[PDB]
Amino acid sequence: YNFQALAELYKNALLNDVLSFWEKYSLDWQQGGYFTCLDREGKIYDTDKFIWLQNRQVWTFSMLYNQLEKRENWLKIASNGANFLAQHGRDSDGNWYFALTREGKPLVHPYNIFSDCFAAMAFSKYALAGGEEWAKDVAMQAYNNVLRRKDNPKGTRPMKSLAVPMILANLTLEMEWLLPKETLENVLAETVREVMTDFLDQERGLMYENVAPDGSHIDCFEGRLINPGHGIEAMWFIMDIARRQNDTKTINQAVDVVLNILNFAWDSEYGGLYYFMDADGHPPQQLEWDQKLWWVHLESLVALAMGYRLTGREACWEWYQKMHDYAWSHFADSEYGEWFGYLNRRGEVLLNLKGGKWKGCFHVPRALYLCWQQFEAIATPL
Amino acid sequence: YNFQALAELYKNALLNDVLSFWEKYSLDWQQGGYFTCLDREGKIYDTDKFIWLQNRQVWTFSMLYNQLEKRENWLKIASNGANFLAQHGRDSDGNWYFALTREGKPLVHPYNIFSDCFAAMAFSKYALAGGEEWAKDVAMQAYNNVLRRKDNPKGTRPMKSLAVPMILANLTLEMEWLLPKETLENVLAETVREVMTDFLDQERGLMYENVAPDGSHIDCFEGRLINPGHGIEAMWFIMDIARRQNDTKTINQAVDVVLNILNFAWDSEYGGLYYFMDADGHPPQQLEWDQKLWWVHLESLVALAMGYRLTGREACWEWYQKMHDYAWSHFADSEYGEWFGYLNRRGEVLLNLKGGKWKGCFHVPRALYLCWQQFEAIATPL
Ligand SMILES: [Cl-]
Ligand SMILES: [Cl-]
């Protein structure tokens, strides 16, 4: 039960390893923004700017500045992204691009709303960290675009996706200081009700990625799809929100679901959770289904640490230890820093990178910070 | 040098194994069209109708009826698809859907032109096999939509894809009997010139998937991408077209390129060709890059058999044998019929299916038929 050693492990990994890696290798001080396409050793292999990741990195450094320590270098790193993004990130109608060239010329315009999501979250927390009022309105613009486009984010077979209420819930938390208290309260209750009613299958105790509007299943590739890590991440989002109202019943239901997903999705031959599974045991359409991904395992560490902190349930601690041994031994790279993102089913490195189009300065530092928080809270009552 | 035994191997695999599998398990005689989502044993795991594959299956049975033997059952199988597709396959503007429900209700409308491509090819050959004149105009409609939309199939970084002239070349061959002789001649010469000028890198002797309009490379994920099997398939397309004009120089250049790609893309640890590679040795964005796919290896068998038949070059025969031993021992399923589509890098079955959203009655029977043709021609001068 060495909670204090775990707290120290996560604190040291965040401050001395992971943040250091991004500080040393990712800053584009000449043109603004960040290089995310970094190989195992931190070498740059592509200079394109993927806006999700640009915004996530602004958020991470702004958050840590605001909540942990006002280190000048963290704020300067956040500014290097925020200024670049404010100048180049949006089309004439204020919609966020998906990708730019190094110098900020637009490459890709997205159909989704997740670009706007990450922009709202980043500029909200940058506004707070930097005391930059202009960033508040950038954030508010991006946020109303998400709620406006929520119901069709992009007749025969109506379906809706878990990702939409998920990101809108967690985002609303990040927008709290800028929103009417009632608006916050309502969206939070509604998104939580939708996630726990429609996407949670009461009979199987599992989260589905896509359901009909009334929560019923549809027998098709989309309607059979399970993404173990995605559902686990949603559940700690739900825990975090339920904790605010001390809704212990909802916290415990979320923990039930996390344990169900882990028991369902663990690879008994090689260890780790599968990336995708078909709920009915049919062959998935995803060629990457059996792969072992960094964030799937990190968000599981967060959910189990948070579940144990919030409920004290022994099963969370037992699963925490099992997940810890697997994730730390397979993804963490002690020699060069940071975590590998992509392993094959056997746990072998599949892409020799620390960042890319979809991995940047976000899931790893956020998860390490959150786990540090849970174990520190466990060791030291507030 | 047992050419006759190879001819017999391919003939028997096509007629007694592969066509039999699709005849036994894939026909939707109640509603029309075909079930492609078939597991290892032929069991159906999804009833959706993926229009690419519906059209490809109409083409395969129509082609064999027209070129091999007028078996009544083959034409009835082709009709079961063609009638279903004519009734349900197109929107009000005559554009082909990407997917329908079992009964033909539209699910997905595609942005690309490859749906129209496969529809033009299918209805062209169905028109010929069935003597159905109405199918000619369905085909001609679909074909002019492809040429009309060829230049933007769906300012900062202009790029074009190999798939477009590739499919337009091979398609033009399948439309020959319906087109002005001059129109055929021109498109064929132009598509061949574009493929062999712009997408073929003269210095590396390799095919690139995406280049700038003038054929120059762009240093980005798309511009570094190699798809070994895709380039090999394009090269036998080029061989087939060059053979028509007895353009021996072009035939031999295409064979040069096939041999270059095989030497570049062969997995020296586990055997087989990689699905995707980054030309500059950076980490790919494709999580499926190291996988071993049925059509990648089948189109390589076709290209090597055809290359050897057309040129007699010993290297083609040596690579044929190497590829044959790998592909037949890893993909062919003697117990239940047909070929697995999807193996991991080690050659282990990754998806336990014989068909799905992207694998249907096309690459396997076409490749087995073409290889039968090459070895029969080698054994028996015409
Ligand atoms: Cl990330
Ligand atoms: Cl196919």
Author numbering:
A (entry chain A), B (entry chain A): 3 to 156, 165 to 392
From the manuscript:
N-Acetylglucosamine 2-epimerases (AGEs; EC 5.1.3.8) catalyze the reversible epimerization of N-acetylmannosamine (ManNAc) to N-acetylglucosamine (GlcNAc) in both eukary­otic and prokaryotic cells. The reaction follows a deprotonation/reprotonation mechanism involving two key residues, which had been thought to be histidines, but which have recently been identified as a glutamine and an arginine. AGE activity is greatly enhanced by the presence of nucleotides, in particular ATP, which serve as allosteric activators.
In this study, we report the determination of the crystal structure of the AGE from the local strain Nostoc sp. KVJ10, which we refer to as nAGE10. In contrast to the pAGE and AnaAGE crystals, which both belonged to space group P212121, the nAGE10 crystal belonged to space group P42212. The structure of the monomer was resolved for the amino-acid sequence from Tyr3 to Leu391, with residues 157–164 missing. The fold is that of an (α/α)6 barrel, with the helices connected by small loops at one end (the back) and long loops at the other end (the front). Gel filtration showed that nAGE10 was present as a dimer, and a melting temperature of 72.3°C was determined by DSC. The nAGE10 dimer, which involves the front faces of each monomer, differs from the back-to-back association presented for AnaAGE and pAGE. A comparison of the assembly parameters calculated by the PISA method indicates that the front-to-front organization is more favourable than the back-to-back organization in terms of interface area, number of interactions and solvation energy. One of the principal consequences of the front-to-front dimer is for the ATP-binding site. Independently of which site is used, the localization of the ATP-binding site at the dimer interface is the determinant of its role in AGE activity, which may involve the oligomeric state of the enzyme.
